[PDB]
C-alpha cells in the first residue's frame, strides 16, 4: 500500500509552518535547467500522475499511519494532520492541485518550462511543494529517453553515411539493462523510456508499463530474439563449446539467434568454430534468421574490429553502394559490453574508418542505458516561482551569488512559439500580454483527475528525429 | 500483479532449449568480483526473497499472461509453458530452488561467494538462471550500503583525529536522495541500505521497507529534524530573507533546525543576517536545539571553509583538546550540495588543514548516495559454476582470453574463515574436505519458503566499523 503522505522528503512535513502567514497560493515549475544534451524528451509524468497522484489518495488510515511514523521519525509532533484531514473531508481525498505540462514525447530545448504545479484551494498552499519529491522523479524517464535519443542520432548519422538509408535503425540499440538497474520499478520505467526511441528490449518490465499507462496499437511496443548466455555455453564443458554452438543454432534455425562467443577465446570461436567447423550451419541460414555473433569482453572497439576482420576472411563480404564492407545477410554482430553514449560513438567511428558498414552491427547497453544517469545530467529541477500572500501575487526566485546556473525563473510561466518557430518560456505572467500567441502547456491534472494524456504511439511520433521526419 | 514469469531478461525465456540435454542441476553463485572498495556489505537479499520469490508465485493466469506476451514479443512460440505448469502442479506454484547466503550485514572482501542458487528438482534445471535477473538487482542495496560505509570510515577517521571521539558519527551523513533516484521502489531500497550505517534520512520510503522486511527494536530506524527549503525562504520575497529566517527559527525554537542560507547570498546571510541582525535568536538556543546553517551552492570545499571563517568571526569559537576550532554548541553547518565519497574526503581534509573540527559539520548526500552507482563499481555478478548432466557433476566457468578479470569460479562453492581469521572461498567442492571449518553460507530460501531471516538490528551489528568495535 502506497501512501502519498509518506512519499515526500521528511523536511517537507514541516514546511506548512514556514511559508509567510496568509499564503493562499504556491505555484512551482519544473525545467531541465540550462548549464551537449541541448534538447530533452519530455516523458514519464503520465505514469506518475496515474500510479500515484490521481483519485482518492488520502484516507483516514493513511493519515493515522503518517502521524504515527512522523511522531517517531521527528521525535516530535510536527505533522499537519489538520491539512490532510481537510483534503479528505472536502475533496474525498483527491488532491486540489492543477498541473499543466508540455505534451509527452515533445523535444524541448534546455531551460524551458516543462510543467507547472499549483494548488486550487487556498487552504492547500502547502500541497504544491509536498509533491515536489514524487514529481521530480520524472527526471529519470526524461533522462533515459533523452540519452537514448542522443544515441539514436549517432547511429542514424553513421548508418546513413555507411549504407545510404536508415533501415533497421530502431533495432540498433537494444536494452540489456534489467539486471543492472536499482529496482523492478526502475526497470519498467527506464525500459519504457528507451522504447520511446527504439523497439528492441530484453527488459520485459517495460512492456507492461506501456500497456497499462500509455498504450500502443500494436500488441507490444518492443521485441527480442532468442539468445545464449555464458551459462548455456559453459554448461557443456570447456572442450564442448562447439557442441553448444551447434545445438543452439540448430534449435533456433529459422529465427535470428544471438550467441555469446567469448566464453574462452572469442577469436578462436569466430575463426575456427563459426568460421570453419560450423560454417555449413551458418551459410545455410535465411536473411530473416541470421546468426548474430556476440563478443562480450576486451576493448569494445578493438574487439569489434578484430571480430569483423576475422569474419570477413571466413565469409563472403560484399561492398555496398556507399563503398562499405558488408557481411552476408545471414551473419551479423552485436556488441553488448561496455556500451554507453561515448563508446557507442567511438565504435561506429572506428568501424567507419575501417570501411565497415554500420549495417553489420547492433549494440546492447545495460547499465549505460538505464542506470549510469543522474538528475544532474540535465539539471532536472523543481522550483517555486509565484506565491500569493495577503491577496498579493509576488514573483519569487532563487539566485545564489556563487552559482548563476542555479538561478530560477520568476513569476507565472508559459511556453510559446517564437516567430521563427522555436520555443520560448515567458516569465512574470508576460504570456498574458498575448504577444507570443497561446500557451503551449496543457492542463494534464486537476483536482484528482487526469485531464489529458497521450498514447505511446503519439509519444513516439513526437520524439522522432528530424532525419526520420524528412 | 507482479508476475515472476515476466520478471527476467527476455533471452532467458529461451534458455531451457540451450542447456546440454540430460542436465538435472544448474548451480550458480553471486560475487562482487575482484578487479578502493576492498570489502562489501552484504545486504538486501531478504527483501527480494520476501517480496518476489516466496510462496505461490506461479498461477494458471500468470502462465497464460506470459505465454501471450512472449508470443508477440518474440513473434514466435518459444516460451516453456510445460516447465512452469510443472511447478504449478507439483509444488503449488512454489519455486523448487535453494539459496544459501552469507548473513546480511556481513562485511566480506571482494571475490568471495556471497550467495548460491540451485534447483531442487531435476525438471527445473532451467529455473536457477531464470531468476538471475531479479537476484542480481541485489547489487544495488549491496553497493549503497558499501559506499555509505566507506564514507562512514572517512568521517570516523577525521572526527577521531579532530575531536578525539566518534560522538555523533551516525548522524554525520544524511540521506537527501529521495528526489534524485529513479523510482519510489529504488528510494526505499537505497534509503534502507544507507541506514545500515547511519541514522539520518529524509528518504521516508526507507522506514517502511525496514519495518516490513527486516524489523528493528526501536520504533523507527532513521530520524530527521525540521528544515527549510528554498521555497519557504524565497516565498517571503527577496527583501524579506531576514523575516523568513526569523519566522522559521522561532517556529522551531526548541528543536534542531536546518536553514538553507544561499538563496541570494550565502556570505551576506552568514555575516550580516545570522551574524548580526538575528544573532540574538541564535546565541539563546539550547545545545539540543542548534541552528544548522545550510549552504547549497558554490565549490563545496571553498564554501564550507568561507562559511566557517565568517561564523568564527561573528560567534565565540573555542579550541578543543586536539587543537581544533569549534563553533558554539547552538550553531552547526550542513553541506548538502555536491557531496559524494570523493568530495566528502576533500571537504574533511580541507577542514582539517584549516584547523576546523569535524564536529562542526554534517553532510547531506542525494544523488551521490543513492543514484550515482552502478553494478560495475563492485562488479556484482551471477555465474553458473556447476552442472550435473547424465548424472555426472561438471565444474564449469568462463575465462575470456582478453579479460582475466571476468574469469568465474569453478564447481561447488563454500565460504570459510581462514586460520588467521580472514575469509576464503573454496572451489570444486573442496569445502567437503572439512579442512576449513563450517561453511558460512546458510540456507535462506528453500522450495518457496524463507528459511532464515535477520533483523535490521542484527544487520547493523554485523556491518559495524572496526573503530566502532
Ligand atoms: O544479444 C542478445 N539479444 C539480441 C541480439 C540482437 N538483437 C536483439 C536481441 C542477448 C544476449 C544479450 C543479453 C540480453 C540481456 C541481458 C544480457 C545480455
Ligand atoms: O538539512 C536538512 N536536514 C537535516 C539537517 C541536519 N540534520 C539532519 C537533517 C534538510 C534541508 C535538507 C534537505 C533534505 C532533503 C532533500 C533536500 C534537502
Curated annotation (Swiss-Prot), chain A:
Q: Which residues carry this modification: Phosphotyrosine?
A: 171
- Please give the PANTHER family that the UniProt record associates with this protein: NICOTINAMIDE PHOSPHORIBOSYLTRANSFERASE (PTHR43816:SF1)
User: GO cellular component terms?
Assistant: cell junction; cytosol; extracellular exosome; nuclear speck
Descriptive protein name: Nicotinamide phosphoribosyltransferase
Record-linked SUPFAM superfamilies:
Nicotinate/Quinolinate PRTase C-terminal domain-like
Residues reported in the UniProt entry to bind diphosphate: 179, 230, 294
Tell me the pathway: Cofactor biosynthesis; NAD(+) biosynthesis; nicotinamide D-ribonucleotide from 5-phospho-alpha-D-ribose 1-diphosphate and nicotinamide: step 1/1
- Consequence of substituting residue 230 to A: Reduces activity towards nicotinamide
Give the primary localization class: nucleus
Give the result of residue 159 to S, as annotated. Answer: In a colorectal cancer sample; somatic mutation
Per the record, what are the reactions this protein catalyses? beta-nicotinamide D-ribonucleotide + diphosphate = 5-phospho-alpha-D-ribose 1-diphosphate + nicotinamide + H(+)
Q: Where in the cell is it found?
A: Nucleus; Cytoplasm; Secreted
Species source reads Homo sapiens
Q: Name one GO biological process term.
A: signal transduction
Summarize subunit and interaction data from the UniProt record for this chain: Homodimer.
**MF terms (GO), sorted A to Z:** cytokine activity; identical protein binding; nicotinamide phosphoribosyltransferase activity
Q: What does this protein do?
A: Catalyzes the condensation of nicotinamide with 5-phosphoribosyl-1-pyrophosphate to yield nicotinamide mononucleotide, an intermediate in the biosynthesis of NAD. It is the rate limiting component in the mammalian NAD biosynthesis pathway. The secreted form behaves both as a cytokine with immunomodulating properties and an adipokine with anti-diabetic properties, it has no enzymatic activity, partly because of lack of activation by ATP, which has a low level in extracellular space and plasma. Plays a role in the modulation of circadian clock function.
- What CDD domains does the entry give? PBEF_like
The EC code for this enzyme is 2.4.2.12
Curated annotation (Swiss-Prot), chain B:
**Which portions of this protein are annotated as coiled-coil regions?**
none
Q: Where in the cell is it found?
A: Nucleus; Cytoplasm; Secreted
Residues annotated as carrying Phosphotyrosine in the record are: 171
Write out the catalysed reaction: beta-nicotinamide D-ribonucleotide + diphosphate = 5-phospho-alpha-D-ribose 1-diphosphate + nicotinamide + H(+)
Instruction: Enumerate the residues binding diphosphate.
Output: 179, 230, 294
Q: Which family is this sequence assigned to?
A: Belongs to the NAPRTase family.
Q: Which UniProt keywords apply?
A: Acetylation, Biological rhythms, Cytokine, Cytoplasm, Glycosyltransferase, Nucleus, Phosphoprotein, Pyridine nucleotide biosynthesis, Secreted, Transferase
Q: What positions does the entry give for beta-nicotinamide D-ribonucleotide binding?
A: 202, 294-296, 336-337, 367, 375
One Gene Ontology BP term is: positive regulation of ERK1 and ERK2 cascade
Q: What does this protein do?
A: Catalyzes the condensation of nicotinamide with 5-phosphoribosyl-1-pyrophosphate to yield nicotinamide mononucleotide, an intermediate in the biosynthesis of NAD. It is the rate limiting component in the mammalian NAD biosynthesis pathway. The secreted form behaves both as a cytokine with immunomodulating properties and an adipokine with anti-diabetic properties, it has no enzymatic activity, partly because of lack of activation by ATP, which has a low level in extracellular space and plasma. Plays a role in the modulation of circadian clock function.
Question: In terms of domain of life, where is this protein from?
Answer: Eukaryota
Outcome when changing residue 202 to N/S: No effect on activity towards nicotinamide. Alters specificity, so that the enzyme acquires activity towards nicotinic acid
- Cross-referenced InterPro entries, in alphabetical order? Aldolase_TIM, DUF5598, N/Namide_PRibTrfase, Nicotinamide_PRibTrfase, Nicotinate_pribotase-like_C
* Modulation of this protein's activity: Inhibited by FK866. FK866 competes for the same binding site as nicotinamide, but due to its very low dissociation rate, it is essentially an irreversible inhibitor.
Quaternary structure, per UniProt, is:
Homodimer.
This protein's pathway: Cofactor biosynthesis; NAD(+) biosynthesis; nicotinamide D-ribonucleotide from 5-phospho-alpha-D-ribose 1-diphosphate and nicotinamide: step 1/1
Gene (UniProt): NAMPT
Entry EC number(s): 2.4.2.12
Phosphoserine modified-residue sites: 455
Molecular-function annotations in GO = cytokine activity; identical protein binding; nicotinamide phosphoribosyltransferase activity
Originating organism: Homo sapiens
Listed under GO cellular component are: cell junction; cytosol; extracellular exosome; nuclear speck
Q: What is this protein called?
A: Nicotinamide phosphoribosyltransferase
Tissue expression as described in the entry: Expressed in large amounts in bone marrow, liver tissue, and muscle. Also present in heart, placenta, lung, and kidney tissues.
